[PDB]
Amino acid sequence: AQIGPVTDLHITNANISPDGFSRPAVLAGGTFPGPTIAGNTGDNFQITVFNDLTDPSMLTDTSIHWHGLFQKGTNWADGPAFVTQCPIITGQSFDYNFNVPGQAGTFWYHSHLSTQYCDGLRGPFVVYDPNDPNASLYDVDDDTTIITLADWYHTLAQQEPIGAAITADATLINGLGRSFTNTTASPLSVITVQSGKRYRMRLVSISCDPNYLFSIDGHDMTIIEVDGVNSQQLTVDQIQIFAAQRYSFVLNANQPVGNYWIRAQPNSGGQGFDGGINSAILRYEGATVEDPTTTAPTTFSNPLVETDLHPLADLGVPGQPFRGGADDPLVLNLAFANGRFSIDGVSFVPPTVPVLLQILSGAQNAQDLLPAGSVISLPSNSVIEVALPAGAAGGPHPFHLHGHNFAVVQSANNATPNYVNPIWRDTVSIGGTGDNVTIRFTTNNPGPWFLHCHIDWHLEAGFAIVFAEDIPDTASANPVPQAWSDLCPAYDQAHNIST
Numbered sequence: 001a002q003i004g005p006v007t008d009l010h011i012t013n014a015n016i017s018p019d020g021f022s023r024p025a026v027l028a029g030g031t032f033p034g035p036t037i038a039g040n041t042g043d044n045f046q047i048t049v050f051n052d053l054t055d056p057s058m059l060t061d062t063s064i065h066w067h068g069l070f071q072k073g074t075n076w077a078d079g080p081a082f083v084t085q086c087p088i089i090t091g092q093s094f095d096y097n098f099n100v101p102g103q104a105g106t107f108w109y110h111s112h113l114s115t116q117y118c119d120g121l122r123g124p125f126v127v128y129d130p131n132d133p134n135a136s137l138y139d140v141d142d143d144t145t146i147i148t149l150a151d152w153y154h155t156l157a158q159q160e161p162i163g164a165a166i167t168a169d170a171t172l173i174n175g176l177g178r179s180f181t182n183t184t185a186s187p188l189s190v191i192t193v194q195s196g197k198r199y200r201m202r203l204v205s206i207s208c209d210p211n212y213l214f215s216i217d218g219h220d221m222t223i224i225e226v227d228g229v230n231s232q233q234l235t236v237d238q239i240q241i242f243a244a245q246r247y248s249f250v251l252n253a254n255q256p257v258g259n260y261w262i263r264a265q266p267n268s269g270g271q272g273f274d275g276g277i278n279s280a281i282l283r284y285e286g287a288t289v290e291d292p293t294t295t296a297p298t299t300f301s302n303p304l305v306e307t308d309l310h311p312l313a314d315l316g317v318p319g320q321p322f323r324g325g326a327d328d329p330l331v332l333n334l335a336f337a338n339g340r341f342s343i344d345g346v347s348f349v350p351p352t353v354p355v356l357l358q359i360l361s362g363a364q365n366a367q368d369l370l371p372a373g374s375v376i377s378l379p380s381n382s383v384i385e386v387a388l389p390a391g392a393a394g395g396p397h398p399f400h401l402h403g404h405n406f407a408v409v410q411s412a413n414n415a416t417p418n419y420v421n422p423i424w425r426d427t428v429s430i431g432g433t434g435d436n437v438t439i440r441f442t443t444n445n446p447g448p449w450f451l452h453c454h455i456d457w458h459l460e461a462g463f464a465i466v467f468a469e470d471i472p473d474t475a476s477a478n479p480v481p482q483a484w485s486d487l488c489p490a491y492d493q494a495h496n497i498s499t
């Protein structure tokens with residue numbers, strides 16, 4: 001069952017064996033992935049998070065981010081540790097009380113402390129639209145049509161060297177899959193469809209690192225949503241999905257009744273499908289209960305290309321139709337050396353006092369904010385452009401902005417910008433050497449918004465900056481509840497920190 005929009009959510013430690021190998025984890029709702037949190041557009045969500053963690057090897061503090069939800073007027077509820085709050089300590093709870101006006105689509109939630117989400121704290125978050133403009137394109141859209149793609153590690157995250165090329169041990173599809181080494185024939189996930197019906201498959205990357213080449217043997221996929229943004233229909237036979245991205249696609253159950261492989265090939269870790277790695281099963285009602293015998297093509301004739309996507313609504317692009325054609329045009333220098341990432345010459349290391357609390361305590365320019373050099377102010381009611389030229393090791397890097405979605409004016413692997421009708425999204429691959437992926441948005445949401453690579457190992461190694469959007473209006477726009485004001489005193493007392 002789905003939970004929400006008003007619900008408790010307990011965060012616990014438990015052993016799990018999603019690929020046959022037992023290890024302890026950090027779980028929401030007792031499962032991997034966590035339960036789906038759901039509601040309708042404009043609803044009030046109140047997710048009271050109970051931190052019941054006791055195993056220090058995965059951290060006993062926690063904080064949860066609602067990925068892709070704008071949090072307008074509720075910056076304090078966004079979740080990134082030391083940006084919008086101090087962590088919740090064990091044996092305490094915290095009500096994330098916010099609203100979702102003007103958003104409907106496929107999202108997710110995850111820990112936003114250190115690399116803790118890699119240890120298991122990740123689940124789907126779906127905001128349905130009772131008047132969805134795509135409703136007539138499908139028959140079925142429910143918890144059974146969510147497809148999660150996850151990387152899974154046998155080593156605990158706090159034992160992964162900072163700045164290293166860290167590699168997974170299994171791909172999990174809906175929580176199940178097989179290990180790349182010492183492979184055992186552990187259970188595969190099954191997605192069941194009825195011949196003749198059309199399904200809104202909500203594809204969610206909950207990855208900590210790899211991108212996946214996702215396909216379904218014998219089937220194609222008609223994209224209708226990108227990171228929460230309704231799209232024009234785009235039919236593809238393969239989707240390369242980067243960490244934290246989401247797509248809705250229509251699956252037409254129009255092939256013969258049978259069993260078909262579902263494939264998710266990561267860019268690192270195990271290559272291919274030997275022993276049923278990187279796989280799940282699409283089963284038609286009435287099919288024999290047996291593994292598929294289908295094969296992939298040698299090459300995919302209609303892969304997703306990001307410049308082919310266009311919004312369903314007339315969203316346009318803010319600003320003027322040329323590079324630098326914005327009120328505040330930025331170019332970030334994105335680099336890696338010696339195990340650490342940097343942005344504009346500064347490697348991100350979380351501050352002792354969360355950025356939001358520094359601003360509410362009176363610090364009002366970005367040079368007064370800590371970490372020094374890691375906070376850039378943005379002016380209010382302005383068009384912002386951010387060029388993100390690639391080249392830093394460990395690519396392709398999927399960059400994500402909190403508090404906002406953005407027009408993708410220039411995409412990976414294509415030097416031509418689009419000032420007319422590019423897709424809008426919230427996480428974007430910045431591509432390869434010589435690319436100049438560029439995003440635009442308008443500043444109508446006061447507060448500190450994290451910008452970072454969504455390969456969690458890279459964020460841990462410093463690949464982040466904070467956009468302090470409209471510092472002067474942050475306090476009036478974001479009144480804070482007493483329970484939020486209590487978080488840093490409690491956390492600092494528990495950890496013997498002075499501030």
Ligand SMILES: *[C@@H]1O[C@H](CO)[C@@H](O[C@@H]2O[C@H](CO)[C@@H](O[C@@H]3O[C@H](CO)[C@@H](O)[C@H](O)[C@@H]3O)[C@H](O)[C@H]2NC(C)=O)[C@H](O)[C@H]1NC(C)=O
Nearest residue numbers: 323324325329330331385386387388389390434435436438
């Ligand atoms: C990606 O696109 C951005 C624009 O969106 C390009 O930024 C431009 O970068 C050049 C230098 O590479 C800038 O010109 C330089 O300016 C300094 C003075 O600030 C001057 O001293 C240098 O001689 C040179 O003129 C230009 O200002 C800038 N545009 C903006 C908005 O900052 C960037 O080069 C592109 N990157 C790649 C890898 O294609």
Ligand SMILES: *[C@@H]1O[C@H](CO)[C@@H](O[C@@H]2O[C@H](CO)[C@@H](O[C@@H]3O[C@H](CO)[C@@H](O)[C@H](O)[C@@H]3O)[C@H](O)[C@H]2NC(C)=O)[C@H](O)[C@H]1NC(C)=O
Nearest residue numbers: 305306307308409410411413414415416417418419420422
């Ligand atoms: C590289 O990225 C550029 C920019 O996003 C892509 O260019 C766009 O290509 C589309 C599709 O062909 C062009 O739209 C076409 O416009 C014509 C004339 O209106 C229309 O009759 C066609 O039906 C279609 O709508 C679009 O104008 C063009 N934009 C720009 C700024 O050049 C390009 O396709 C991408 N390259 C690859 C290999 O995908």
Ligand SMILES: [Cu+2]
Nearest residue numbers: 065067244400
């Ligand atoms: Cu995220």
Ligand SMILES: [Cu+2]
Nearest residue numbers: 067068401402
């Ligand atoms: Cu986010």
Ligand SMILES: [Cu+2]
Nearest residue numbers: 397453455458
């Ligand atoms: Cu990265």
Ligand code: NA
Nearest residue numbers: 316317318319
């Ligand atoms: Na425009």
